[model samples]
Target chain A: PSDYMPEVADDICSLLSSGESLLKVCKRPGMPDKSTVFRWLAKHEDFRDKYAKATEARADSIFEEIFEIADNAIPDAAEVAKARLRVDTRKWALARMNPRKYGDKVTNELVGKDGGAIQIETS
Target chain B: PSDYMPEVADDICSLLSSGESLLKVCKRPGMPDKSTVFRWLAKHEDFRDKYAKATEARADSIFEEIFEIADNAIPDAAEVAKARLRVDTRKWALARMNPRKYGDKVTNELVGKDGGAIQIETSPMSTLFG
Candidate 1:
């Protein structure tokens, strides 16, 4: 199927797997419209899981180190690492808790609204 | 243009060009505040060149390789690999750049102004309000 193309599917999968957003994939050559990609994503479980799992794995890997460092004897390294880890873990947790955060940030910014101003301050 | 912000142009372009940074434009929403964006960016041809070239060929793809390994490499193997990298890098770099030299030797129990504190035993490492 022409509209059912998979080369772009492969690329999209690779991109999503690599932590790239759908919008970024669209920016690449041979990408279909934004809506088409979304439709494909929602309709395909395999693709969606791969994409989601890749993102989850990425987030987990990022914090895994900082988590390891949590009980460190070193106070400064623990503090800095924890702060940085909070930033990442929250970003990922929020992404999973509400996938909409990811989509909204991507779409709104794609159209260039306040260049996407959704900030979450961490204390 | 209301969107005619200049510096973010550099910042965004920098991210675009950096071995790091950018949406991966839209990714960092409002990073313009946290840091300067797009100083040397598309609107400015030279900045744009810098941006494009930034990610063009990285000196060390170790981070990306790490990214790959993190996602795919066996958990134990990958962890050890990262440990090795950290240990190996620190073994030499630490001897030369002894973090022990800079920050103060603050009390061990208390977290510094910096919070959790790896407590590298220098003076203090603070990015804000330097």
Candidate 2:
């Protein structure tokens, strides 16, 4: 850790909460790069917590924007597609940040309906 | 439009159907750049249709990989995270390609309970509301 500043974390969180994408935040002048941010997350517990919350906030911001487009006057097909792209991007980001709550559900059934265990023979 | 090759489009579809990403396909030797692919999509109807199907195929591919990771063995935290990233990336890409079938839902309600119509009041109501 090369003197990671608390102020930098604060700035990142503020930008994220305001709906800025992680790429955009990383691109800001004088701000650390994405790898640096990731490193901070891995090294500092407080920074990691803030990063998680920021991702959720960013997802909420995108969700609200999707509704805003719908609630307003009827938009063109292109505009609607653009809104969907934003929603999908942010939604995926949120899922990656917190997979337990947001990731896709996968279930495996080893037992059949007849109360018999299914066996697989691999050659 | 430049001489668009049908064979190239066919190859793209084949790769996509085989679980390759658009980015990866574009990076292949002798493959056109992304902008060129997009241009082809805009100009050729058949190519556009194939592209749509290709995106769905990519999504299915990622979905199956995720299940494989889950069913085969317990993955470490890093492995699980990597799998999730792949799924999320492909899912979002699919949603963008076909928003009608895959996009988030949005609903607008113009009426309130009891089927009452809503009114909006603005400044200088004397001229409009008169």
Candidate 3:
């Protein structure tokens, strides 16, 4: 039997682009398991690229929903908290999906005690 | 029932540190489903940090195995390909788990007629399209 089918790739992309998580996408009935999908990603550069794009699409979908909630008047304090939670959950996932764009930023700098720049001496 | 338990998180971290895949770790009897685990990660900051470290440990384990294969003699081409597949699969998953450190890098620079840099953009998506 063939390890990969074009139809499988199509279904995978469709599910992912519709905002399904990768683990959930691969777990659909009659779909390939997650490991198989990962192996296919490893073996096929084209498939890997397609997967990355699908994830970006998912992130975009999440962002749209977040904005939709924010634009509407929330019902109450509880509802506001619920909306915040929903957006936060997806934001965390989006960061993982496309870290270069959404991941946390950290910067570290070395300086002297008096706030001057510190220089290292090397041989 | 609670969606998460402290002991469960401990087990997960131990399993992951021992080099088990997330799927496999979650598949153990009485363990939570993948979605639940993801929800826990989303809801709990400390758990998320622990999970990230565990994944980094898993990546280190996979790297060690890859090097071991490279250092040893392979029985055949089939074995070599199998090893490569193993490493590649884990690496792909690792990148997803911690993209800031492990993900693909892309740099796009727009050049002027004089070959000087005009503008630049960097992103994983940019790498995909550009």
Candidate order by TM-score, highest to lowest? 3, 2, 1
| Chain B TM for prediction 3 | 0.60
What class would a CAPRI assessor give candidate 2's docking? Answer: incorrect
Please write out the lDDT profile of model 1 over residues A26-118, one tens digit for every residue.
887667767887788788787677666656544333322332332221334344444445444544453463353221121111211233332
Q: Which tens-of-lDDT digit does each residue in B28-88 have in candidate 1?
A: 6655421123322324576556544553422133234335434653355434444434333
In terms of TM-score, which candidate is strongest?
Answer: 3
Question: For model 2, how does the per-residue alpha-carbon lDDT over A88-117 read when each residue is reduced to its tens digit?
Answer: 444554455345555565433334334333
Ranking by lDDT: 3, 2, 1
Supply the TM-score for candidate 1: 0.27
> What share of the reference contacts survives in each candidate?
0.00, 0.00, 0.00
DockQ of each: 0.01, 0.01, 0.01
